[model samples]
Target chain A: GSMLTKDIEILRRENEELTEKMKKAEEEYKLEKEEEISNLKAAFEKNINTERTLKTQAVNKLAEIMNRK
Target chain B: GSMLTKDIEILRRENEELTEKMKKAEEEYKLEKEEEISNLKAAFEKNINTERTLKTQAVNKLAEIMNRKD
Candidate 1:
């Protein structure tokens, strides 16, 4: 009976350790996801701004040409 | 001895369930990341095309006005 109790204790300890490891892994995964999303948002906004700049330049040049005529 | 064996079995089952849950969550996270990146690429390409079209139209108008002047 004593030996059975010892074996149970060991299994319980291992279960706790595995639970903690899983929790840590979950937290790390969340952090990685947030970082990736942030980077994507930054790049998306930069591309939008660049397009806006190009459109503005084209509009300005067209206006200059019209005024000369 | 039998009771101890049963308790250990339950603990082992619970451990396996947690492992499976963690693996599924990781797979879902990866899929989400890929979808987001794909959407960003599509939007980026659309913006580039819009800018190119606008520039082309503007240049054509300028040339038309210059031809009239001549």
Candidate 2:
């Protein structure tokens, strides 16, 4: 452990370290949250895309079934 | 209390009552579950319908937007 320094110096350095860490944390949180939202949006769109593909396929299969009947 | 001399009559009556109630409950449960599944299917299809409508609207809007520039 570092030896005890002048009170102001000790507290001041601690404050700066915490401030820097907090700024980085906030930036990281923003990007993380944004990525999470974007990922969900992509996921939902993918589901819709899958649905559309399946629906079209369903129509085709139904048509084939009807043709056979 | 109703005088019940016969054990068979008492138990048999209880069994019949339970059986009838159970049959009705099973019927209701079947209808409820089927309705839930059909409702979800309808809801999903509705979402697709809404999407198709919006897609057509988007196409029309884009057409108007570009046509105005011409």
- Candidate whose DockQ is highest: 1
Which runs in model 2 stand beyond 4 Å of their true positions?
A: A1-69, B1-5, B60-70
lDDT string for model 2 (B11-70, tens) is 445556645665675567557656755675566567767766655555554455447465
DockQ of each: 0.55, 0.01
lDDT score, candidate 1, position B8: 76
Q: Which ten residues in a row have the lowest lDDT in candidate 2 chain A?
A: A1-10
What is the C-alpha local distance difference test score of each model?
0.79, 0.58
lDDT of 1 by residue, B1-70 (tens): 3544677788788878877887897888789888877887788778678887887787777678767565
Q: What's candidate 1's DockQ score?
A: 0.55
DockQ-derived CAPRI band for the predicted complex in model 2:
incorrect
Model 1 lDDT tens row, A7-29? 77887887788878878887888
Error of 1 at B21 (Å): 1.3
Q: What RMSD does each model have against the real structure?
A: 3.4, 27.5
Q: Candidate 1: misplaced stretches above 4 Å?
A: B1-4, B67-70
Query: Candidates' TM-scores?
Result: 0.75, 0.40
